[PDB]
């Protein structure tokens, strides 16, 4: 697993809180992308990770004149264009709901208004994995309808192992315990 080994090498060598903070953030981003790949694989949908909203619009509505609209340049993780409906997808890996709420608010208020002007029926979907319990929580009524079961096989233990080693290595470093938390 060259992903695990790459983090381990960085954790072995890191000496400063700033480089350590970046490793921690990279591990959190990596387990996020791991969940997205596994989810898209299980649902046999196309795997994407951050698509510019303008690019989504051009895929679903090639004839659009971009310059006719105020398109926020957000990059949701992924999308599903059924031909009648656009599900905007964002992955989350978290034990809590705050990150979901924050992103739900953002994409609801920024994406829906312009998609209604353009005329594309859209739903904001956030799929969260709890990295401790592996349970999946979905917001998006149309998504649940399309995918009533999510047969993922998730294992977040290696991400926990790596990040724990990093936190252990900097447990007596005041600068670090500030930056991560
Ligand atoms: C899970 O939901 C998200 O948090 C998410 O997918 C965030 C992202 O994709 C960014 C990379 C990332 C960081 C931490 C984790 Cl754990 C997972 C992914 C990349 C995009 N930025 C938002 C942004 C930044 C600059 C310009 C624009 Br426009 C938009 C946030 C982090
Ligand atoms: Cl360093
Ligand atoms: Cl964004
Ligand atoms: Mn993203
Ligand atoms: Mn995401």
Q: How was this structure determined?
A: X-ray
Q: Outline where DSSP puts E strands in the chain.
A: 78-81, 86-93, 122-129, 136-139
Atom 17 of ligand 1: nearest residue by CA position: 29
Spatial contact of 79 and 46, defined as CB atoms under 8 Å apart: no
Q: Ligand 4 center to residue 157 CA distance, Å?
A: 22
Find the discontinuities in the chain where C to next N exceeds 2.5 angstroms and give the residue preceding each: none
Torsion, CA 29, CA 33, CA 34, CA 36, rounded to 10? 140
Question: Which residue in this structure is represented by tokens 């600068």?
Answer: 175
Q: Outline where DSSP puts E strands in 4-135.
A: 78-81, 86-93, 122-129
Cα-flanking dihedrals φ and ψ of residue 56, to 5°?
A: -55, -50
The set of residues, in sequence order, having a beta carbon less than 8 Å from that of 129 and lying 6+ positions away, is 35, 39, 91, 92, 93, 135, 136, 152, 154, 156
Sheet with 78-81: strands ordered across: 78-81, 86-93, 122-129, 136-139
User: Cα 68 from chain centroid?
Assistant: 29
Q: Tell which residue, 40, 110, 121, has the closest CA to residue 78.
A: 40
123 CB near ligand 1 (under 6 Å): no
User: Cα separations (Å) of 161 from 144, 157, 177?
Assistant: 32, 6, 18
Task: Give the Cα separation of 108 and 106 in Å (integer).
Answer: 6
Beta strands 122-129; 136-139: pairing state: antiparallel
Resolution in A: 2.0
Q: Ligand 5 center to residue 172 CA distance, Å?
A: 32
Q: Ligand 5 center to residue 92 CA distance, Å?
A: 5
Atom 22 of ligand 1: nearest residue by CA position: 75
Spatial contact of 153 and 38, defined as CB atoms under 8 Å apart: yes
74 CB near ligand 1 (under 6 Å): yes
How many other C-beta atoms are found inside a 10 Å radius of the C-beta of residue 118?
18
Torsion, CA 127, CA 142, CA 122, CA 91, rounded to 10? 10
Spatial contact of 86 and 80, defined as CB atoms under 8 Å apart: yes
Total count of residues recorded for the chain: 181
Task: Give the Cα separation of 22 and 179 in Å (integer).
Answer: 10
Evaluated on CA atoms 129, 131, 133, 134, the torsion sign reads positive
Judged by its nearest atom, the ligand closest to the C-alpha of residue 32 is 1
Atom 16 of ligand 1: nearest residue by CA position: 29
Tokens read off for 66:
């971009």
Task: Give the Cα separation of 181 and 157 in Å (integer).
Answer: 20
Q: Tell which residue, 118, 93, 107, 99, has the closest CA to residue 140.
A: 107
Task: Give the Cα separation of 92 and 175 in Å (integer).
Answer: 28
């Amino acid at each position: 697993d060259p992903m695990y080994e790459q983090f381990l090498q960085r954790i072995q060598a890191v000496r400063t809180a700033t480089v350590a903070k970046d490793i921690s953030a990279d591990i959190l981003e990596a387990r996020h992308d791991y969940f997205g790949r596994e989810l898209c694989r299980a649902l046999d949908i196309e795997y994407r990770n951050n698509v510019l909203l303008d690019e989504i619009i051009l895929d679903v509505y090639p004839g659009v004149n971009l310059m006719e609209y105020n398109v926020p340049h957000v990059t949701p993780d992924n999308y599903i264009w059924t031909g009648d409906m656009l599900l905007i997808l964002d992955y989350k890996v978290s034990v809590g709901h705050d990150s979901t709420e924050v992103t739900y608010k953002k994409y609801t208020t920024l994406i829906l208004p312009v998609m209604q002007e353009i005329g594309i029926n859209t739903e904001i979907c956030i799929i969260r994995a709890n990295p401790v319990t592996n349970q999946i929580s979905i917001v998006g009524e149309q998504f649940k309808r399309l995918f009533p079961t999510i047969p993922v096989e998730l294992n977040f233990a290696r991400f926990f192992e790596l990040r724990k080693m990093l936190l252990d290595k900097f447990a007596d470093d005041e600068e670090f315990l500030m930056m991560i938390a």
